[PDB]
Design an enzyme around this catalytic site. Structure first.
Site, short mmCIF file in Angstrom:
data_model
loop_
_atom_site.label_atom_id
_atom_site.label_comp_id
_atom_site.label_asym_id
_atom_site.label_seq_id
_atom_site.Cartn_x
_atom_site.Cartn_y
_atom_site.Cartn_z
N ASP A 8 -38.52 51.88 119.85
CA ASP A 8 -38.89 53.29 119.95
C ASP A 8 -39.69 53.73 118.71
OD1 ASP A 8 -39.19 55.67 121.36
OD2 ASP A 8 -37.21 56.47 120.86
N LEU A 58 -30.47 67.94 109.92
CA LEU A 58 -31.69 67.13 109.88
C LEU A 58 -32.16 66.80 111.30
CD1 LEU A 58 -30.81 64.67 106.94
CD2 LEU A 58 -32.16 66.75 106.81
N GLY A 59 -31.20 66.72 112.22
CA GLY A 59 -31.39 66.43 113.64
C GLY A 59 -30.12 66.74 114.42
N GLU A 60 -30.25 66.97 115.75
CA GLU A 60 -29.11 67.28 116.62
C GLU A 60 -29.36 66.80 118.05
N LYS A 94 -25.06 60.72 110.11
CA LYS A 94 -25.22 60.79 111.56
C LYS A 94 -23.82 60.81 112.18
CE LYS A 94 -27.39 58.36 115.45
NZ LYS A 94 -28.57 57.54 115.85
C1 LIG Z 1 -30.61 57.61 112.83
O1 LIG Z 1 -30.78 58.55 113.90
C2 LIG Z 1 -31.37 59.76 113.61
C3 LIG Z 1 -31.80 60.14 112.35
C4 LIG Z 1 -32.45 61.35 112.12
C5 LIG Z 1 -32.77 61.80 110.73
C6 LIG Z 1 -32.13 61.25 109.62
C7 LIG Z 1 -32.59 61.48 108.34
C8 LIG Z 1 -33.73 62.25 108.11
C9 LIG Z 1 -34.37 62.84 109.22
C10 LIG Z 1 -33.88 62.61 110.49
N1 LIG Z 1 -35.52 63.64 109.11
C11 LIG Z 1 -35.73 64.69 108.20
C12 LIG Z 1 -36.30 65.86 108.67
C13 LIG Z 1 -36.75 66.83 107.79
C14 LIG Z 1 -36.63 66.65 106.41
C15 LIG Z 1 -37.20 67.67 105.45
C16 LIG Z 1 -37.02 69.10 105.92
O2 LIG Z 1 -37.96 69.71 106.40
N2 LIG Z 1 -35.80 69.66 105.79
C17 LIG Z 1 -35.48 70.96 106.39
C18 LIG Z 1 -34.68 69.02 105.11
C19 LIG Z 1 -36.03 65.49 105.94
C20 LIG Z 1 -35.55 64.51 106.82
N3 LIG Z 1 -34.93 63.37 106.27
C21 LIG Z 1 -34.22 62.31 106.69
O3 LIG Z 1 -33.93 61.40 105.92
C22 LIG Z 1 -32.64 62.21 113.21
C23 LIG Z 1 -32.21 61.87 114.47
C24 LIG Z 1 -31.58 60.65 114.68
N4 LIG Z 1 -31.19 60.35 116.06
O4 LIG Z 1 -31.85 60.82 116.97
O5 LIG Z 1 -30.20 59.66 116.25
#
Ligand SMILES: COc1cc(-c2ccc3c(c2)Nc2ccc(CC(=O)N(C)C)cc2NC3=O)ccc1[N+](=O)[O-]
Length: 258
Positions: A117, A13-15, A34
């Site tokens: 942020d 979902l992120g890296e 995470k």
């Molecule tokens: C809490 O810290 C972070 C959380 C996220 C993250 C967590 C959950 C999701 C997300 C991103 N975005 C995300 C991105 C894309 C999608 C849908 C999608 O296109 N796919 C391929 C699954 C769903 C999600 N859903 C989430 O719930 C990403 C990065 C961080 N971070 O930078 O620490």
């Protein structure tokens, strides 16, 4: 019940480390995991949170040196991907997302938390397109024992930061989040960021202070939400509109969406 604690990591979902989409082996419930001293503060701040417009924290598991944060999965992805470049999105969608963003920010400020942020990458959408504030890794306590502490640390993302954060040694937390919500609203309505940073050296920022709204991004925005942006994107944080007054704004209360 056996195997109810086993989760399969199905996609990234992120890296800080990484974030994976986890699916329960028994129930097929989807959660975000995470994998990572701001992490100790992230867990602590997350344990304090419980709101429909804030990504829910389910718990944390420590396995040696790697920390696992179990968070609410938002299947709609990021608000960032609902913004069409140079266009934005329909005004009623932006208004609904802005209402939900205000609900989440009111909640956080009410318990003395500042996100620091706020941007469309950190605004996630669930299956019903409900906005959820995400990532409390830069977040901090600005009010404790009903005593406000002024901030001084440089946090955030330059196109979204308030100008006092670059000009003043100390500043109030809440007007900083109000400003970044106004940059989010601008992005939703115009599909572009007005400036690289809010400084006089930045020509686009100087034009806005000169009220040159005949230029982009402002010329793509209707007069009613633009009047609200004129009250949010105020350089003096003491003269900037507060959330209680945003809730009284004419466009904020304009019926638009079915
Ligand atoms: C809490 O810290 C972070 C959380 C996220 C993250 C967590 C959950 C999701 C997300 C991103 N975005 C995300 C991105 C894309 C999608 C849908 C999608 O296109 N796919 C391929 C699954 C769903 C999600 N859903 C989430 O719930 C990403 C990065 C961080 N971070 O930078 O620490």
């Amino acid at each position: 019940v056996p195997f109810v604690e086993d989760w399969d990591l199905v996609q990234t979902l992120g890296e800080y480390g990484e974030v994976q989409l986890a699916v329960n082996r028994v129930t097929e419930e989807a959660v975000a995991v995470k994998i990572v001293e701001n992490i100790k503060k992230e867990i602590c701040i997350n344990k304090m949170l419980n709101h429909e417009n804030v990504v829910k924290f389910y718990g944390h598991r420590r396995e040696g040196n790697i920390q696992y944060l179990f968070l609410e999965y938002c299947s709609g992805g990021e608000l960032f991907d609902r913004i069409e470049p140079d266009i934005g999105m329909p005004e009623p969608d932006a208004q609904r997302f802005f209402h939900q963003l205000m609900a989440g920010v009111v909640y956080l400020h009410g318990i003395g938390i500042t996100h620091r942020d706020i941007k469309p990458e950190n605004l996630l959408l669930d299956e019903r397109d409900n906005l959820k504030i995400s990532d409390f890794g830069l977040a901090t306590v600005f009010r404790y024992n009903n005593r406000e502490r002024l901030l001084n640390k440089m946090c955030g993302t330059l196109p979204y930061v308030a100008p006092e954060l670059l000009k003043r040694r100390e500043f109030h937390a809440e007007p900083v989040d109000v400003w970044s919500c106004g940059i989010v609203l601008t992005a939703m309505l115009a599909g572009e960021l007005p400036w690289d940073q809010p400084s006089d050296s930045c020509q686009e920022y100087s034009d806005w202070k000169e009220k040159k709204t005949y230029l982009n991004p402002w010329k793509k925005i209707d007069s009613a939400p633009l009047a609200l942006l004129h009250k949010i994107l105020v350089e003096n944080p003491s003269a900037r509109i507060t959330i209680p007054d945003i809730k009284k704004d004419r466009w904020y209360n304009k019926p638009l969406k079915k």
